[PDB]
Design a binder for these strands. Structure first.
Ligand SMILES: [Mg+2]
Ligand SMILES: [Mg+2]
Ligand SMILES: [Mg+2]
Ligand SMILES: [Mg+2]
Ligand SMILES: [Mg+2]
Ligand SMILES: [Mg+2]
Ligand SMILES: [Mg+2]
Ligand SMILES: [Mg+2]
Ligand SMILES: [Mg+2]
Ligand SMILES: [Mg+2]
Ligand SMILES: [Mg+2]
Ligand SMILES: [Mg+2]
Ligand SMILES: [Mg+2]
Ligand SMILES: [Mg+2]
Ligand SMILES: [Mg+2]
Ligand SMILES: [Mg+2]
Ligand SMILES: [Mg+2]
Ligand SMILES: [Mg+2]
Ligand SMILES: [Mg+2]
Ligand SMILES: [Mg+2]
Ligand SMILES: [Mg+2]
Ligand SMILES: [Mg+2]
Ligand SMILES: [Mg+2]
Ligand SMILES: [Mg+2]
Ligand SMILES: [Mg+2]
Ligand SMILES: [Mg+2]
Ligand SMILES: [Mg+2]
Ligand SMILES: [Mg+2]
Ligand SMILES: [Mg+2]
Ligand SMILES: [Mg+2]
Ligand SMILES: [Mg+2]
Ligand SMILES: [Mg+2]
Ligand SMILES: [Mg+2]
Ligand SMILES: [Mg+2]
Ligand SMILES: [Mg+2]
Ligand SMILES: [Mg+2]
Ligand SMILES: [Mg+2]
Ligand SMILES: [Mg+2]
Ligand SMILES: [Mg+2]
Ligand SMILES: [Mg+2]
Ligand SMILES: [Mg+2]
Ligand SMILES: [Mg+2]
Ligand SMILES: [Mg+2]
Ligand SMILES: [Mg+2]
Ligand SMILES: [Mg+2]
Ligand SMILES: [Mg+2]
Ligand SMILES: [Zn+2]
Lengths: 97, 137, 53
RNA sequence: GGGGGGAACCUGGGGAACUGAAACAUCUCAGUACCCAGAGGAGAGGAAAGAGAAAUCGACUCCCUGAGUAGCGGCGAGCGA
RNA sequence: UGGUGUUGGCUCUUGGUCGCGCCUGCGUAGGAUAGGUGGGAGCCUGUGAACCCCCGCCUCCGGGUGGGGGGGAGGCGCCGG
RNA sequence: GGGCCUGACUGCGAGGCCUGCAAGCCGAGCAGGGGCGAAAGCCGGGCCUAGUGAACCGGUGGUCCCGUGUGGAAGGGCCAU
RNA sequence: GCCCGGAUAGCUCAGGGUAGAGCAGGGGAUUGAAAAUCCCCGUGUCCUUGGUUCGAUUCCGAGUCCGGGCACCA
């Protein structure tokens, strides 16, 4: 997985921290880190398929921004899109962000 | 239930909570039996029944009350309930709320020191043969 | 000390403050220790009682 | 219009180990080395949803001080506003 | 591998737990199918009692309960073994 | 062997033994409040020399010392364990 | 450390009105024997103490001990 086409969100780097011990809050000696290592956290990208000017357009967008796709289509209403390829329509739509 | 009771039922509505005063004005409207009904005040202490130490028991010397003077003894039953006579259906309304309130006061005065819950989980006013109304203690 | 010879505090019966620590054999001596001890809080002798450490 | 180059410098995306802790794993080395993208004669930052106790100050950057202070820390080695 | 996102429509059967409605609660002495205490001498009847006809039915096997068809003025408690 | 008892004290401590450090050890005397004794007096465990574990981290009972603008609260300090 | 728990006769065991059940032991029937079967019988503060109820192994508090569970250990 890779880059939200609407929000721009991308994989980030996060540590995966391993602990042991009873937290001080719980009356323990405190926590010890038994290991820390890099990992990636991904955006929740999914396929949204959508039909604009009869043609079929398809986005890789993070779940959080699925609604945002459809908002693009509503704002696509008064647009002179007819007769276009899907490639340039997508371009057209993306331009309202 | 008998027509006589079915009647009264209309002048109630469970949902509504009512007020010490609002309930005092109903009592009269709810005492349709051939005699000076009483009134009673049923609570529902939010304490543990099967126990002791946290047992609600005592007396209250109602300013007016009874008319049958005061000092009524009340003691929570095996369940979480406590009941007591607050006066007779006669009594001008502004005379009952004085006792209802004076009795409920004693209850709080006899709450334990180790009791979980809102204590007065619920309270109601009634009459010997009439229905009942919840109330904001 | 052992599981039987145990540690224990002595608490002042009048201010509830522990002022002493000592030990006992709990077989030999199942009952809670009572003893007079100077409580420095109260500034006078007081009967102290065994309290769990 | 872009593409490609430029000793160092700059920013951004990624990012070690020896080593130190007189062993070592958290910690350190160090966000360093290095790779990558971009910039430019600089770059970055910048006109408060800020500071923080002054009833205060007034964008940002850079130097000196504050201070090895405040703190952080297998409360160790150390790190450090 | 649980939870949750992407992830929707219909249905069947279901429990938990919240409010109210009601019924079930039988050691023995006993008119006999007593939930804990409190209140309380009248309540149940032209908003139809006494048994009777189809019965949701539970059952500890006697009965407990509940709607109605028939039905036209008496059943149930203080009383007290 | 008996009688009473809880000094198996709280606040300190002159002066020493030991000794690289850190520890370890002995201690007269004064104050508080006690015990026993008619009293002188003795009593800060046990004839004596083994029966033990620095720190860090944290627990529990006090204390009411600090509390991040202020009042509280969180959390920490301090005494005891 | 905290949470769930069992204790009932010689062994093992189920249980607001109560005190029993399996086989161990003993007596009797039977047998060639060992059994199996069959009939009777014991073997109790129901861990301890304190408290409800008219009273209780039964509800509750407190203890003591083994059983189990989870976690932590400077
Ligand atoms: Mg993780
Ligand atoms: Mg740590
Ligand atoms: Mg969402
Ligand atoms: Mg000591
Ligand atoms: Mg001793
Ligand atoms: Mg002091
Ligand atoms: Mg270039
Ligand atoms: Mg370039
Ligand atoms: Mg960077
Ligand atoms: Mg870099
Ligand atoms: Mg690597
Ligand atoms: Mg390393
Ligand atoms: Mg290494
Ligand atoms: Mg090393
Ligand atoms: Mg080394
Ligand atoms: Mg090595
Ligand atoms: Mg670093
Ligand atoms: Mg310049
Ligand atoms: Mg510039
Ligand atoms: Mg800029
Ligand atoms: Mg502006
Ligand atoms: Mg330190
Ligand atoms: Mg450091
Ligand atoms: Mg650093
Ligand atoms: Mg600086
Ligand atoms: Mg997974
Ligand atoms: Mg989750
Ligand atoms: Mg799913
Ligand atoms: Mg002697
Ligand atoms: Mg003393
Ligand atoms: Mg000295
Ligand atoms: Mg020395
Ligand atoms: Mg003295
Ligand atoms: Mg003396
Ligand atoms: Mg004397
Ligand atoms: Mg003297
Ligand atoms: Mg001395
Ligand atoms: Mg350390
Ligand atoms: Mg500490
Ligand atoms: Mg404290
Ligand atoms: Mg504050
Ligand atoms: Mg303060
Ligand atoms: Mg203060
Ligand atoms: Mg603050
Ligand atoms: Mg305030
Ligand atoms: Mg505090
Ligand atoms: Zn004291």
């Amino acid at each position: 997985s890779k880059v939200c086409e609407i929000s721009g969100k991308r994989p980030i780097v996060a540590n995966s921290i391993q602990r042991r011990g009873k937290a001080k809050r719980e009356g323990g000696v405190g926590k010890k880190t038994t290991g820390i290592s890099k990992r990636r956290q991904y955006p929740n990208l999914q396929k949204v398929r959508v039909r604009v000017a009869g043609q079929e357009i398809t986005f890789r967008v993070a779940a959080s921004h699925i609604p945002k796709v459809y908002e693009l289509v509503e704002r696509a209403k008064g647009l002179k899109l007819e007769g276009l390829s899907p490639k340039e329509i997508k371009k057209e739509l993306l331009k309202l962000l | 239930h008998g027509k006589r009771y079915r009647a009264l039922l209309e002048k109630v509505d469970p949902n509504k909570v009512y007020t010490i005063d609002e309930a005092a004005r109903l009592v009269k409207e709810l005492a349709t039996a051939k005699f000076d009904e009483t009134v009673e005040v049923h609570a529902k202490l939010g304490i543990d029944p099967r126990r002791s130490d946290q047992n609600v028991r005592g007396t209250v010397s109602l300013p007016h009350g009874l008319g049958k003077a005061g000092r009524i003894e009340f003691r929570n039953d095996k369940t979480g309930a406590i009941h007591a006579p607050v006066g007779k259906a006669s009594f001008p309304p502004e005379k009952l709320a004085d006792n209802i309130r004076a009795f409920i006061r004693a209850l709080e005065a006899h709450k334990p020191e180790g009791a979980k819950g809102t204590f007065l989980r619920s309270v109601y006013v009634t009459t010997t043969m009439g229905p009942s109304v919840r109330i904001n203690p | 000390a052992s599981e039987v010879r145990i540690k224990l505090l002595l608490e002042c019966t009048e201010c509830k403050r522990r002022n002493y620590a000592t030990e006992k054999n709990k077989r030999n001596t199942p009952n809670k220790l009572e003893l007079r001890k100077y409580c420095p809080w109260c500034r006078k002798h007081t009967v102290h009682r065994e309290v769990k450490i």
